[PDB]
Design a binder for these strands. Structure first.
Lengths: 142, 142
DNA sequence: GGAGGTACCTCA
DNA sequence: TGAGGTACCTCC
């Protein structure tokens, strides 16, 4: 039921598995499925292309980006398998530890993207999806 | 017929005779009567009190400020008797030369403040008043 | 100028 | 967060 709002384009890169971690100033004990919502903040076409170029260098020339990075909607989910301090992140994930310098690093696995994305208004930190949109999101995930 | 738009509170201080010069980056050959209009930019009550404190120190304890500094209106007029370079300003007005460091300094005399001030939309530099507001302004000056 | 789009900032 | 007030910026 629990959701994290993330700015685009990083939001969609997370549910595509291209971005593998998300950094925050705070810790969460939450483990398991974590829904990902894009914030309302639209990214300029410039930062989308620059971030895409960067992730091409990190992941390979032919990585498949989403066609769009829609704002203000529920995108999909990840499994939040750990929430690591920066020190723990460097010890356990040396190959990607450069990808976040935040005090706490959310380690995400098993991303899933919704083919139909639903408009939504987010909140800070981990917040709870409303039942109706949560039910429709799980149905979409077939 | 010619007018200069000036930000408040400086605009009203000019037509009161409290501010004696106005600095600009450009020169004008205009001499004689120059109407003074306040721009639309409203001044914060903080810059009004700080500027009043400063001019109290420059002119004396009991100098009489206007009760209000209205924006976007025709305030009055001065006689523009010279337009001096900064070098000429220092040579000719050593007692007040510190009051403007602009490339050109408009030397104003015989200020008159209108009892009834008329709303107006200004322009850059010296611009020409419309004849209806000019006629009404001259009449107000009795 | 004056007008208004946009980025920035704050939020009993 | 999302919302919107405000300051800042540009202007065939």
């Amino acid at each position: 039921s629990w959701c994290l709002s993330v700015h685009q384009p990083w939001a969609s890169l997370l549910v595509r598995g291209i971005k593998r971690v998300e950094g925050r100033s705070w810790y969460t004990p939450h483990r398991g499925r974590l829904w990902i919502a894009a914030t309302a903040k639209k990214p300029s076409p410039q930062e989308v292309s620059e971030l895409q170029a960067t992730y091409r260098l990190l992941r390979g020339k032919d990585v498949e980006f989403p066609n769009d990075y829609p704002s203000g909607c529920l995108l999909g989910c990840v499994d939040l398998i750990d929430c690591l301090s920066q020190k723990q992140f460097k010890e356990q994930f040396p190959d990607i530890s450069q990808e976040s310098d935040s005090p706490f690093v959310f380690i995400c696995k098993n991303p899933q993207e919704m083919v139909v994305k639903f408009p939504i208004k987010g909140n800070p930190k981990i917040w709870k999806l409303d039942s109706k949109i949560h039910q429709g999101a799980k149905k979409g995930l077939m």
